[PDB]
Symmetry: D2
Subunit: 199 residues, 4 copies
């Protein structure tokens, strides 16, 4: 089973380089993740890490005026980003993620699911078991849909609307990797040996 409330709990359990650790605590609390073969666990974290962090801090910033707020309480600010020459990207985060999350009032539950769908990426290269990873993705989204239809009955197209925030998350995610400024927001790509302390 892939119970929504257990994803909700996972999000809560971690509600505020240390980023990585709190990422790993989160992932372990997602149903079944830990039952994946260990190398696949590494791969899925090395692949999704930046999307996962961006999605979290975007949600966190829903109430923040101006910029974004990190879990470490680092408060970034739009102009600080513009001065670092990453304004276009930064505004993208604000407009395509933070704003959209705000206007539809995204649940902590819905966030968890989106990040779980991101986590369970069957397209990540090197997986011993792509098909197992695809099935967990499927169990996350089915559960998310039920959740939306039960909790938000007056909004028939809310599910899809959450889904369609993922291409944006994907663009932003790639672009962030290309400007050193963003190291201050999401660190660099996690190293194998280190992640392997998910063991």
């Amino acid at each position: 089973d892939m119970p929504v409330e257990k994803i909700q709990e996972a999000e809560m359990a971690v509600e505020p380089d240390k980023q990585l650790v709190t990422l790993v605590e989160w992932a372990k609390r997602i149903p079944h993740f830990s039952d994946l073969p260990i190398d696949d666990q590494v791969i899925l974290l090395r692949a999704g890490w930046n999307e996962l962090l961006i999605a979290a801090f975007s949600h966190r910033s829903i109430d923040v005026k101006d910029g974004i707020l990190l879990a470490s309480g680092l408060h970034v600010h739009r102009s600080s980003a513009h001065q670092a020459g990453v304004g276009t990207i930064f505004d993208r985060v604000l407009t395509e993620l933070v704003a959209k999350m705000r206007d539809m009032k995204m649940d902590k539950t819905e966030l968890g699911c989106l990040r779980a769908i991101v986590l369970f990426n069957p397209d990540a290269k090197g997986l011993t078991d792509p098909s197992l990873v695809e099935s967990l993705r499927e169990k996350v989204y089915a559960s998310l849909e039920e959740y939306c239809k039960q909790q938000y009955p007056e909004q028939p197209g809310r599910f899809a609307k959450l889904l369609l925030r993922l291409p944006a998350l994907r663009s932003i995610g790639l672009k962030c990797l290309e400007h050193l400024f963003f190291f201050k927001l999401i660190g660099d790509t996690p190293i194998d040996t280190f992640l392997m302390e998910m063991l």
Copy 2:
């Protein structure tokens, strides 16, 4: 309304830089697209052109062994790609797009809808009316969902599974823009004055 059969007919009307022309014919036949402010029509094609083209050829290549097949009948081939130093990206198209479309046997109707959802991108910068473009996207996906419930009732999660092919389409789309080789598959970014004969 946003009737799927009219999207299906749009796809068929164009079934085999001439690429741009046939893209434009396609877009015209999507319900309401032409009712958009003309500058918005231009932005939406400039933004989506490459995803729209890759999505098209990927679906066309469902049957093809080895590589991908273009509407001009140029048949590319995996080795040609690897020779050109774009193998990683090329294999991403085959793995994340072509193969997934093949395994799920994507409808020409489902292709049309995904492509229309891509066309009606509310995040495209410069739109005089994002709000209106958002609503058309919403009319497309709702209409695609009923269609999947109608036509594939034994596959509860098929709608989401189609949607979740869009972040892949988005990464592949951006990576393609970074290798000269791909000019031979999708040309370069269309220029406004030129698109402006959607008038």
Copy 3:
């Protein structure tokens, strides 16, 4: 020996995908290039192709007002490149190469030598003998220097000034590779098998 007039002849013999052909005829005519092991001949052209061609068209454009002029007589134009969304990079070619070439009135002979320095790139990965390639670059620059002291004795720092046009040519060279527009000016990266008809 590495006699400058033989490089000058090389330049002239080719003075106006066919691009690659005329690049190959050019390199053959550079003293000693053909004495290089044939795999190193391939590597050097595959590495330097884009800078070699940009350098060529930049010099040919010294006279042209507005934009740049290709050997095929394609005349690009500054607006056309800005409409294509590659204005910044195009402007760099005009400002950092074309203009500097014009102000200093670069020789055909000095063009030949710079391009031969670029062709004998000892840093090219996979060379069977980087040391031999280094020595040919050495024979080109020493030969260039004598020629500058002989022909422009009024200008003590002209040699260096020509050399320092190379970091820019390396910048522009890389940036060109990331925008499909430039396929129209330099093609894509040459493929091994094809170049191998240097045999």
Copy 4:
């Protein structure tokens, strides 16, 4: 005048984000840099900062086995970089910069000059006075040439050899900017406001 020993002293005065401070102290000690309009001083530093820091750490690493050595005593290590997925670029620094500096035994004085040449980049966008910036460059290189003919009379082509390390320094420089990893080596692009404490 542009006396080489004053550049030598500049290098020495700084011999071991704090990075930027020591960069600023360095620049100030370069003859005439401080005479430049203040806005131009910020531009040249914002433009050259990465090349300047890379070239410094490269030279510092001449003796180090294995990897690179930072002024802060951070000792990076080849496989450390390979694990972070930046092995190709890292190898480039080692082969194209550190190795070549080693084999030719580059002087601290020759380092100073090369870095001065890089600092005095007349191609930097936004300069109020690119002509004045060009002249200081010229005074550095002429001065570097006499120094090389005085100090290394047995090596006629040493000057050109040093110069020809600059395109490499430019390639590496750009590529470094595209991987979050390197924020650990060079921080990100310096901000206007902050550099303006050159005042």
